[PDB]
mmCIF file of N, CA and C in Angstrom:
data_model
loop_
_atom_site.group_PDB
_atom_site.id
_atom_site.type_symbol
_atom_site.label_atom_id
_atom_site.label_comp_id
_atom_site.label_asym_id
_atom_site.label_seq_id
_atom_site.Cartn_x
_atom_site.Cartn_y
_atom_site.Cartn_z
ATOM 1 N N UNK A 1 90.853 114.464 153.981
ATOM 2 C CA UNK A 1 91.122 113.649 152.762
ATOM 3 C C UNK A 1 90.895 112.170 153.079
ATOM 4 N N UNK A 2 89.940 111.723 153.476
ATOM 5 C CA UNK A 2 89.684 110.306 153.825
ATOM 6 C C UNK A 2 87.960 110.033 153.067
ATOM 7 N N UNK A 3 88.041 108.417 153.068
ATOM 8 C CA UNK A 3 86.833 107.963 152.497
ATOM 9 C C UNK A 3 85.775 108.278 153.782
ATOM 10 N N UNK A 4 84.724 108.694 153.114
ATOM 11 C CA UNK A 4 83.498 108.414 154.531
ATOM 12 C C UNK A 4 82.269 107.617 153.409
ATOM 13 N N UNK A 5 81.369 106.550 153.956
ATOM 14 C CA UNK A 5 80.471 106.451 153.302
ATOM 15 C C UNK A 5 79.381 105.960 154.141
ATOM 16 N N UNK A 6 77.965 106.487 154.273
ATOM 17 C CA UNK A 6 76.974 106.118 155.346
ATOM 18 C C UNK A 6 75.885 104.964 155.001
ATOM 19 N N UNK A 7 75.253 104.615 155.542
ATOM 20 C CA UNK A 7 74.218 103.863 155.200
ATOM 21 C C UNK A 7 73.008 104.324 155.337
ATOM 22 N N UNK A 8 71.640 104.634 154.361
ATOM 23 C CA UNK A 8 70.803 104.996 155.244
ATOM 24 C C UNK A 8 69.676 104.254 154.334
ATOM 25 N N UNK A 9 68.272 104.228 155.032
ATOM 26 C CA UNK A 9 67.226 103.660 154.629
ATOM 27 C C UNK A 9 66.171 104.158 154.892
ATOM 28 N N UNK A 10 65.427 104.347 153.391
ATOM 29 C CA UNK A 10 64.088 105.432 154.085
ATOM 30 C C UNK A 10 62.679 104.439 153.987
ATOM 31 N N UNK A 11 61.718 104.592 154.714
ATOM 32 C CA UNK A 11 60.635 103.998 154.246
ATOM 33 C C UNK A 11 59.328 104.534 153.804
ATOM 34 N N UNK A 12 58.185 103.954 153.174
ATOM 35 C CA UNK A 12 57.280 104.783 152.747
ATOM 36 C C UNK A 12 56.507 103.639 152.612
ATOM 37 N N UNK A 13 54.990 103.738 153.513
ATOM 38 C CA UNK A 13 54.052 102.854 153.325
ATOM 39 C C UNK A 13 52.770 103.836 153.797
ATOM 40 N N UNK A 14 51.482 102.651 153.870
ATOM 41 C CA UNK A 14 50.581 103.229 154.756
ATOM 42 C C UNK A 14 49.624 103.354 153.659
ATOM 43 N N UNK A 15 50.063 104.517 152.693
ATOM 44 C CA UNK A 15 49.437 105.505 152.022
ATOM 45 C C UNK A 15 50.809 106.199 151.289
ATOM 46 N N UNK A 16 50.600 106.693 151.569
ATOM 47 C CA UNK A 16 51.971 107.726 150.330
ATOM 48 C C UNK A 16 52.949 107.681 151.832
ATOM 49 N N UNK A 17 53.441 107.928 152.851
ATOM 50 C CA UNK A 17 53.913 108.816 153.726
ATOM 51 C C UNK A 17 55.568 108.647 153.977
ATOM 52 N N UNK A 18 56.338 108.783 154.335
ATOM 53 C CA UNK A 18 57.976 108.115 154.896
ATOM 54 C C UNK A 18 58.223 108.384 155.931
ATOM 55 N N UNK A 19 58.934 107.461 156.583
ATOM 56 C CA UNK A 19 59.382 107.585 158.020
ATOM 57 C C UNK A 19 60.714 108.516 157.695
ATOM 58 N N UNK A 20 60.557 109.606 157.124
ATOM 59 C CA UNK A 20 61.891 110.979 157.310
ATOM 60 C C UNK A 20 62.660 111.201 158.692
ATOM 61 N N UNK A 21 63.001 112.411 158.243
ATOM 62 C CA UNK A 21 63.955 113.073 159.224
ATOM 63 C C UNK A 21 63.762 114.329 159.342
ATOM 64 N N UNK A 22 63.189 115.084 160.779
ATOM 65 C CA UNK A 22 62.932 116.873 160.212
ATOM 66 C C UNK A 22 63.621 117.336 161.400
ATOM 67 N N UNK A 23 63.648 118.791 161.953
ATOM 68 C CA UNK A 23 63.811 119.107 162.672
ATOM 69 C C UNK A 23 63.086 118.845 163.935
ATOM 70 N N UNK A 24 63.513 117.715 164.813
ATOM 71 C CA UNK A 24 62.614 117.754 166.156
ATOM 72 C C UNK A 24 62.400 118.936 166.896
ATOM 73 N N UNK A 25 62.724 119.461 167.538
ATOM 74 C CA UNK A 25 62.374 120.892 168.194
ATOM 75 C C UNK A 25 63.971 121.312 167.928
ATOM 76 N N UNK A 26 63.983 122.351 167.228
ATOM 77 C CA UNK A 26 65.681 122.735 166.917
ATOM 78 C C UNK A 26 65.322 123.247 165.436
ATOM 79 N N UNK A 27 66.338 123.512 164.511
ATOM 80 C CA UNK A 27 65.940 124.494 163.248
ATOM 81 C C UNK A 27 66.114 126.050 164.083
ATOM 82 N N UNK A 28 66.524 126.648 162.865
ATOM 83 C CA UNK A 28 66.422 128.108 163.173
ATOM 84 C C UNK A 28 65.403 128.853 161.970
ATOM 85 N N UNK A 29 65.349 128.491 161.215
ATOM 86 C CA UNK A 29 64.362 129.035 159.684
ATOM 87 C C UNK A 29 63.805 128.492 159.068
ATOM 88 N N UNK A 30 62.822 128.371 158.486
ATOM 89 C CA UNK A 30 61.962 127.335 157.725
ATOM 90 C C UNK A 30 62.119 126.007 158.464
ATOM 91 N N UNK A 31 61.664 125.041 157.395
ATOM 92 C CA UNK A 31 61.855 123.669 157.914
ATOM 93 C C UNK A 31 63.074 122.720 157.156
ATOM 94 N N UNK A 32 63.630 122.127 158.257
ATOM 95 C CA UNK A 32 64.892 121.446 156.926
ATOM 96 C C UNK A 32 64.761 119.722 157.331
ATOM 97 N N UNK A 33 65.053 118.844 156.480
ATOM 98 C CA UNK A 33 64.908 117.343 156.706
ATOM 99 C C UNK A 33 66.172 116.483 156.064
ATOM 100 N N UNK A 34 66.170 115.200 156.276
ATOM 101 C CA UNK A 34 67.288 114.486 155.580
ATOM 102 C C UNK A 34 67.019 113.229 155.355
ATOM 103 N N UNK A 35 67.783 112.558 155.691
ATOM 104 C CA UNK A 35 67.772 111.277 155.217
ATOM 105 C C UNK A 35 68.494 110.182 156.784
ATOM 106 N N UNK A 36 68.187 109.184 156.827
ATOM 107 C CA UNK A 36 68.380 108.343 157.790
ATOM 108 C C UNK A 36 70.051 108.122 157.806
ATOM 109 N N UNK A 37 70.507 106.905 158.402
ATOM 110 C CA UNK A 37 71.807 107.034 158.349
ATOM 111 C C UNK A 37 72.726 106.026 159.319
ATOM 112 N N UNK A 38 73.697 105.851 159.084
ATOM 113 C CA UNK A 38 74.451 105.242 160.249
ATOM 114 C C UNK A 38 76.015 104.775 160.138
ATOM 115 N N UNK A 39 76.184 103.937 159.071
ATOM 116 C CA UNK A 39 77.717 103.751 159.149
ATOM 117 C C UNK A 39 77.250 102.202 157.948
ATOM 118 N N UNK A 40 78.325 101.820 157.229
ATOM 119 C CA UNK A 40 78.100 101.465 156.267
ATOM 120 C C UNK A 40 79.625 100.204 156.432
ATOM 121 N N UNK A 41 80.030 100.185 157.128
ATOM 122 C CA UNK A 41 81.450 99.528 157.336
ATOM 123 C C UNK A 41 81.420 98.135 158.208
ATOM 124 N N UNK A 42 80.189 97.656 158.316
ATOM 125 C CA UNK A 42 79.803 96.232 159.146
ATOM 126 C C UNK A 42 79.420 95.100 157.609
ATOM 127 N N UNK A 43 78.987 95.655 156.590
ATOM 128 C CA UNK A 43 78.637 94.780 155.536
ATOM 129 C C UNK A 43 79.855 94.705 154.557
ATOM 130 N N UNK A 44 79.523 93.820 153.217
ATOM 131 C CA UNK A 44 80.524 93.959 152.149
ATOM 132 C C UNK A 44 80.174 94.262 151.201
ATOM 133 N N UNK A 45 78.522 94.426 150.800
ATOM 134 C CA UNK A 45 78.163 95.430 149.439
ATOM 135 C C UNK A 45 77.123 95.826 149.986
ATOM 136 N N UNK A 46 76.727 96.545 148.709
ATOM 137 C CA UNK A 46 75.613 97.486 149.230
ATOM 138 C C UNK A 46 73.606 97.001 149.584
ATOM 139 N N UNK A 47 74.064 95.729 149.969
ATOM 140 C CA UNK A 47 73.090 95.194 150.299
ATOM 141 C C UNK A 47 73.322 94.351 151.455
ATOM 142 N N UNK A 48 73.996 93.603 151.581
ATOM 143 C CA UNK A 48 74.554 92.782 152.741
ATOM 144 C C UNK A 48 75.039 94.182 153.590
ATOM 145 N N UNK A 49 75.012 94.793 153.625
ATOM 146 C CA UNK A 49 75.035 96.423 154.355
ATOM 147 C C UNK A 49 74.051 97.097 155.203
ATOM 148 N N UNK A 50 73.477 96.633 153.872
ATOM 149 C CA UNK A 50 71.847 97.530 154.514
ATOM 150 C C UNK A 50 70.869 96.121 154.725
ATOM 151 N N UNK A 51 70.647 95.767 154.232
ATOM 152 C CA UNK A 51 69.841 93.844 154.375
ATOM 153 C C UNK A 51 70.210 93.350 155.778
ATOM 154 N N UNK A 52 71.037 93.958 156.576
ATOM 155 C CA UNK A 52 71.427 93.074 157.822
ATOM 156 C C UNK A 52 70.963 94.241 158.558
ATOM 157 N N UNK A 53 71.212 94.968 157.931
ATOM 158 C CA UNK A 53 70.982 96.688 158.984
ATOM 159 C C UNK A 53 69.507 96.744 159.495
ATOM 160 N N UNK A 54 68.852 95.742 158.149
ATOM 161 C CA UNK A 54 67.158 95.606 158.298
ATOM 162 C C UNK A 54 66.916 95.198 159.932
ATOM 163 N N UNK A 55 67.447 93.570 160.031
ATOM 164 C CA UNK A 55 67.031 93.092 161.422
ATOM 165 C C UNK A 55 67.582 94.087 162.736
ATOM 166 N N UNK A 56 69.129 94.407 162.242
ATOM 167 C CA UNK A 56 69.771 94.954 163.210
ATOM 168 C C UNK A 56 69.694 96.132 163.423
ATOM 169 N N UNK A 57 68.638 97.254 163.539
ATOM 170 C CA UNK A 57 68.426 98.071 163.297
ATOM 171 C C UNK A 57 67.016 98.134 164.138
ATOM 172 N N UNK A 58 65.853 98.152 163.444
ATOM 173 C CA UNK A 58 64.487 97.910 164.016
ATOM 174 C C UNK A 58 64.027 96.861 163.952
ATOM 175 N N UNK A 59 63.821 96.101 163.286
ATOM 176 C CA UNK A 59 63.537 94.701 163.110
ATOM 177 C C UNK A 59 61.941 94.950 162.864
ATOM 178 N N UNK A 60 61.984 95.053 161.060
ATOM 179 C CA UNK A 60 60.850 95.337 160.770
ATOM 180 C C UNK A 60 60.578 94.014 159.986
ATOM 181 N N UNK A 61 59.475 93.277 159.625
ATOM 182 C CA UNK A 61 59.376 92.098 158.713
ATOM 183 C C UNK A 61 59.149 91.879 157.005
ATOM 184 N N UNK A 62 57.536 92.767 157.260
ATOM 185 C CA UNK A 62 57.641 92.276 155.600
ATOM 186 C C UNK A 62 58.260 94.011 155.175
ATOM 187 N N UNK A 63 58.837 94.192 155.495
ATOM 188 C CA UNK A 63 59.678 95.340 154.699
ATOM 189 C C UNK A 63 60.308 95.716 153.242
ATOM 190 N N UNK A 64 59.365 95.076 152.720
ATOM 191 C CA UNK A 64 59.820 94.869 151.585
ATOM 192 C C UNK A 64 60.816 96.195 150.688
ATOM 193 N N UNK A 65 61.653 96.196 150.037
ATOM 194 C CA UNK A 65 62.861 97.163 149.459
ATOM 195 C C UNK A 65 63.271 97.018 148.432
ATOM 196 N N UNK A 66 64.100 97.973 148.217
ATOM 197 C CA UNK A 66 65.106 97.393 146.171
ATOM 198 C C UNK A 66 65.854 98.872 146.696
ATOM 199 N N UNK A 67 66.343 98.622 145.389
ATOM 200 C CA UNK A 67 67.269 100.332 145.273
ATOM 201 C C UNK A 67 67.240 101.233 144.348
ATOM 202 N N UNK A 68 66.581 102.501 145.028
ATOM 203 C CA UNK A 68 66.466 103.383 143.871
ATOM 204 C C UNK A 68 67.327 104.068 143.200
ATOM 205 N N UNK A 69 68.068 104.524 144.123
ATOM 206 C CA UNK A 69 69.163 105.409 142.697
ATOM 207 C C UNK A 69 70.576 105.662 144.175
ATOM 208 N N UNK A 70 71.451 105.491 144.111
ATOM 209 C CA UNK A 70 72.647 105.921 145.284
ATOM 210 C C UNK A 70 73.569 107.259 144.394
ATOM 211 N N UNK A 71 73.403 108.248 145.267
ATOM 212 C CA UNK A 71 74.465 109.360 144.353
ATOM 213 C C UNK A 71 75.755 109.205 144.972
ATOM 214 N N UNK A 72 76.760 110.439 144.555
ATOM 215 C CA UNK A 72 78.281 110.316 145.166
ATOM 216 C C UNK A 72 78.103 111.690 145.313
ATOM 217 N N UNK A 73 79.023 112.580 146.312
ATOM 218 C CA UNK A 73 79.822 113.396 146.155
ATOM 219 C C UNK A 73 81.057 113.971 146.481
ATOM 220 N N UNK A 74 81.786 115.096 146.725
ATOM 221 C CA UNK A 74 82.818 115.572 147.211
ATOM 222 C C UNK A 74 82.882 116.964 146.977
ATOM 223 N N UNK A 75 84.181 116.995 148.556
ATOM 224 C CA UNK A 75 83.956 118.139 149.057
ATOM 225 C C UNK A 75 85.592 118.684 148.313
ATOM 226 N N UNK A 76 85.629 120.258 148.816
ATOM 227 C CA UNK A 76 86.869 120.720 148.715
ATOM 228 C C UNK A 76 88.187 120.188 148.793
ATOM 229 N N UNK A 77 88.731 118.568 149.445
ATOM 230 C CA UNK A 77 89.347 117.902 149.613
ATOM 231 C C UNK A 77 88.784 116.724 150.280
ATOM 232 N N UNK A 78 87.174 116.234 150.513
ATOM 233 C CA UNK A 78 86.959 115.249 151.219
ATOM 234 C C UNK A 78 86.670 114.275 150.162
ATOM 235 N N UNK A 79 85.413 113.511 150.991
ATOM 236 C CA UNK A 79 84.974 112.382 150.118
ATOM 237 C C UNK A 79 83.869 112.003 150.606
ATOM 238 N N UNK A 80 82.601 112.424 150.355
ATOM 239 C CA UNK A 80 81.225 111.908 150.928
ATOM 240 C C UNK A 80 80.627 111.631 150.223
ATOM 241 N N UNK A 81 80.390 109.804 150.277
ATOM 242 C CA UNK A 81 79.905 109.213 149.887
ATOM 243 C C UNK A 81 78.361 108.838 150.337
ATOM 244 N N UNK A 82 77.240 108.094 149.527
ATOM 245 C CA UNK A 82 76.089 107.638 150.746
ATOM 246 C C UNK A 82 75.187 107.048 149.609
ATOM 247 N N UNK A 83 74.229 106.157 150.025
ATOM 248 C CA UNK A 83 73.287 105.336 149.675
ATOM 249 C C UNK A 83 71.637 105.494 149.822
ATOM 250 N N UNK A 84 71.038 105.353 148.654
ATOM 251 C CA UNK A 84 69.555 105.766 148.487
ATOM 252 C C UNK A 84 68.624 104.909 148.515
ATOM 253 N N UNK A 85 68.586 103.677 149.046
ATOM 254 C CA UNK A 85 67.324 102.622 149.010
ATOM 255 C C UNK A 85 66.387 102.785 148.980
ATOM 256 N N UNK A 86 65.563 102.861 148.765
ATOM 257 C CA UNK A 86 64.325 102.992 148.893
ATOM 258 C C UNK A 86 63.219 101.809 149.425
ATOM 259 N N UNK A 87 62.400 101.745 150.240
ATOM 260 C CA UNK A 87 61.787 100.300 150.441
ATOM 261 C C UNK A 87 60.103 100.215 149.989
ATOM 262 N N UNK A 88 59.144 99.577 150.152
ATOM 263 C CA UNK A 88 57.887 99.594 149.222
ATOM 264 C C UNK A 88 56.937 99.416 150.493
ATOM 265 N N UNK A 89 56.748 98.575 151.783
ATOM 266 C CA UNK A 89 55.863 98.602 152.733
ATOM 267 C C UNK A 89 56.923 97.453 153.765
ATOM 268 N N UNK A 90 56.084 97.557 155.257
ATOM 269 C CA UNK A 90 56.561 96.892 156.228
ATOM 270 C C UNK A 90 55.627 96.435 157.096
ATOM 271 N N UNK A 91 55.840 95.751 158.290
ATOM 272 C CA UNK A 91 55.137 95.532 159.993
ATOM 273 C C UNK A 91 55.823 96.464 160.795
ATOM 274 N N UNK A 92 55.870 97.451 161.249
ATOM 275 C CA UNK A 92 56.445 97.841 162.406
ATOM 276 C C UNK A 92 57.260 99.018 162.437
ATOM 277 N N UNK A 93 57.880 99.419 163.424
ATOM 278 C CA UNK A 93 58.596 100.782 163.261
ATOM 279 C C UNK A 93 60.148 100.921 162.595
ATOM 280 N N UNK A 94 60.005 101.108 161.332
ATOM 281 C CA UNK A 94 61.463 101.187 160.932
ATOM 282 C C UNK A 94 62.663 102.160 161.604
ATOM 283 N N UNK A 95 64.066 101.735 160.506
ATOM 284 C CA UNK A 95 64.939 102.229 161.332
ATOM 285 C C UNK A 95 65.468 103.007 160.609
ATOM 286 N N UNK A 96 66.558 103.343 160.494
ATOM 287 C CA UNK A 96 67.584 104.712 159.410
ATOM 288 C C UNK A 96 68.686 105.358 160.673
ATOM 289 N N UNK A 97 68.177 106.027 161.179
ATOM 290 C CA UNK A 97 68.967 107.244 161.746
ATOM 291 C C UNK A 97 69.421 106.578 163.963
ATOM 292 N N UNK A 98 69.972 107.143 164.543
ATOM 293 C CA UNK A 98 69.963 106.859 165.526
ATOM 294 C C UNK A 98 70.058 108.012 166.137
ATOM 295 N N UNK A 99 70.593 109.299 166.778
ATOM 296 C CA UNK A 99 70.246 110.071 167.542
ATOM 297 C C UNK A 99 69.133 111.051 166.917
ATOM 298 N N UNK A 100 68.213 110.408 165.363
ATOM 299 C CA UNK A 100 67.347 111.752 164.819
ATOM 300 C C UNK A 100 65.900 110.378 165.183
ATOM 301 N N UNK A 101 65.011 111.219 165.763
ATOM 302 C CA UNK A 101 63.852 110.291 165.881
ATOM 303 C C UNK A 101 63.191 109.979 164.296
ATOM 304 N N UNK A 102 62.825 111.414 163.471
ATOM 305 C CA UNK A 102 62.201 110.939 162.247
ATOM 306 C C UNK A 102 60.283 110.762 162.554
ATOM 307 N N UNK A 103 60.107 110.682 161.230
ATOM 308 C CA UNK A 103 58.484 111.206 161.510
ATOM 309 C C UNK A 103 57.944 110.298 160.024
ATOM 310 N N UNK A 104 56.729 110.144 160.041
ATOM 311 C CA UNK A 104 55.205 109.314 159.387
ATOM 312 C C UNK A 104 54.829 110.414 158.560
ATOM 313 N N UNK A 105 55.825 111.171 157.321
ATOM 314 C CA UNK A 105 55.274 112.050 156.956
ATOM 315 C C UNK A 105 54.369 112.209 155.818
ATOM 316 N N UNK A 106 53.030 112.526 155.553
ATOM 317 C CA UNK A 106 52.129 112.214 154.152
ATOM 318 C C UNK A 106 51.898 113.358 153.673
ATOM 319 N N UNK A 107 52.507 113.242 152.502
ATOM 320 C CA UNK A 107 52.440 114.338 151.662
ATOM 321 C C UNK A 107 52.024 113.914 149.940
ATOM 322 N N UNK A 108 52.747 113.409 149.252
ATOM 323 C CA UNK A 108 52.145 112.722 148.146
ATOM 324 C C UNK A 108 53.915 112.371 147.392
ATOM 325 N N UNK A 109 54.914 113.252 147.460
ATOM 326 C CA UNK A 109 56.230 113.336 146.785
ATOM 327 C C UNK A 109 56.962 114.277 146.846
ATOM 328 N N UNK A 110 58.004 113.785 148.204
ATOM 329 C CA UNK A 110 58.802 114.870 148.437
ATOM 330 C C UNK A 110 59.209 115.495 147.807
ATOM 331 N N UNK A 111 60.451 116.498 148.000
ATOM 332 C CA UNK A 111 60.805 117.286 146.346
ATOM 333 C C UNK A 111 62.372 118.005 147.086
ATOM 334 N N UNK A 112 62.898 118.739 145.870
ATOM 335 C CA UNK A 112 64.334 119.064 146.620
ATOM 336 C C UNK A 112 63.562 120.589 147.651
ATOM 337 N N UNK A 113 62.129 120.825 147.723
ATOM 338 C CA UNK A 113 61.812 122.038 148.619
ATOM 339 C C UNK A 113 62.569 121.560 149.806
ATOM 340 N N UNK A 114 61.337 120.363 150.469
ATOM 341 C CA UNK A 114 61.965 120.574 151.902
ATOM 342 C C UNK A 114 62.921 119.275 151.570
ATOM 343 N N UNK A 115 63.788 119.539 150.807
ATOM 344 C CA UNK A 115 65.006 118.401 151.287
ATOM 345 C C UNK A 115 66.108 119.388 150.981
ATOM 346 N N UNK A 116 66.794 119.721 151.962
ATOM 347 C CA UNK A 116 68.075 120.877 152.046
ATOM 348 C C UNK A 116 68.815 120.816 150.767
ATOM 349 N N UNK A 117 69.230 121.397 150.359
ATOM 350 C CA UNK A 117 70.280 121.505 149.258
ATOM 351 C C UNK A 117 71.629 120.697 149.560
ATOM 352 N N UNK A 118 72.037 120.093 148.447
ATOM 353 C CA UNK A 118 73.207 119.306 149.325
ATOM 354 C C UNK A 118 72.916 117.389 148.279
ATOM 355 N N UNK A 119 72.023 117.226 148.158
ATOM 356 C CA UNK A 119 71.582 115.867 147.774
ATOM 357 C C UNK A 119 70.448 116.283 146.713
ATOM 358 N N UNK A 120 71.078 116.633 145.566
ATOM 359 C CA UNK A 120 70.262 117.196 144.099
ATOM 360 C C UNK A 120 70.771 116.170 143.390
ATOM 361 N N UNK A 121 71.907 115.192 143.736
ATOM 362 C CA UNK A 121 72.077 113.817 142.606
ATOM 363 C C UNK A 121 70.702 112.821 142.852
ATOM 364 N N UNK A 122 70.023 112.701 143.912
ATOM 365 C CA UNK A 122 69.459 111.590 144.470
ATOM 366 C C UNK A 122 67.116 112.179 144.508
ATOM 367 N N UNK A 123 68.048 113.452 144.824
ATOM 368 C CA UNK A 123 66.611 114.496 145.554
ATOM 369 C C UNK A 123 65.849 114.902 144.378
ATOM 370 N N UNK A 124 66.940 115.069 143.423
ATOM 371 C CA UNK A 124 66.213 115.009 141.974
ATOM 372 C C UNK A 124 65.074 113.785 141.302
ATOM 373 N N UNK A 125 65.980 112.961 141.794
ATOM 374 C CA UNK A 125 65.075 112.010 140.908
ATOM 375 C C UNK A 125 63.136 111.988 142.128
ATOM 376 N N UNK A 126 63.849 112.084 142.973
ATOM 377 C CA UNK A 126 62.803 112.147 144.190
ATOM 378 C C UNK A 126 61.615 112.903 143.956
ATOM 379 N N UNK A 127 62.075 113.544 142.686
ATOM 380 C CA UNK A 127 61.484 114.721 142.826
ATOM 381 C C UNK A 127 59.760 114.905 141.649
ATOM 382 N N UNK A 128 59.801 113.832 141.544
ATOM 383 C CA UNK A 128 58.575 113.172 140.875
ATOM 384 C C UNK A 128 58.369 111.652 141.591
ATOM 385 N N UNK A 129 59.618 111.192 142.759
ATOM 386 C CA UNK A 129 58.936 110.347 143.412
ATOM 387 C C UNK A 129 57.546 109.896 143.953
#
């Protein structure tokens, strides 16, 4: 019964592609992916959050960003919260996640296929992303 809320940031340049999250060698069935991530409790809104997370993080430059849509949810007695940014192009290797490496993936618009069930407030809209 406690608040949790994460930070995460995805990117997508190049061409169509995003620096995701899949199974590095691990998975047991199909393929499953997510979203970046880290902790959300160093800023005071939801930009001074993630806007600092930019340098402190990878330290990418013209990275340019906005925000696409942030969902909520909850569990049987919890509280999981999390954030959907979205960014538009960059210089360099972005950041999101820390023990998930993440991948340059080009496809044209992800969809809730390979995005696990679990994030249909956010994955939806994604879903003509």
């Amino acid at each position: 019964m406690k608040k949790l809320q994460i930070a995460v940031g995805i990117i997508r340049n190049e061409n169509n592609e995003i620096f995701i999250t899949r199974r590095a060698a691990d998975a047991h069935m199909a393929n499953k992916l997510e979203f970046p991530g880290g902790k959300i409790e160093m800023g005071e809104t939801p930009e001074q959050a993630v806007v600092r997370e930019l340098q402190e993080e990878v330290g990418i430059t013209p990275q340019h960003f906005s925000l696409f849509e942030k969902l909520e949810y909850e569990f049987p007695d919890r509280h999981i919260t999390l954030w959907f940014w979205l960014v538009e192009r960059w210089e360099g290797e972005p950041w999101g996640k820390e023990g998930q490496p993440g991948e340059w993936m080009s496809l044209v618009g992800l969809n809730a296929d390979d995005f696990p069930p679990a994030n249909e407030p956010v994955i939806a809209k994604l879903k003509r992303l």
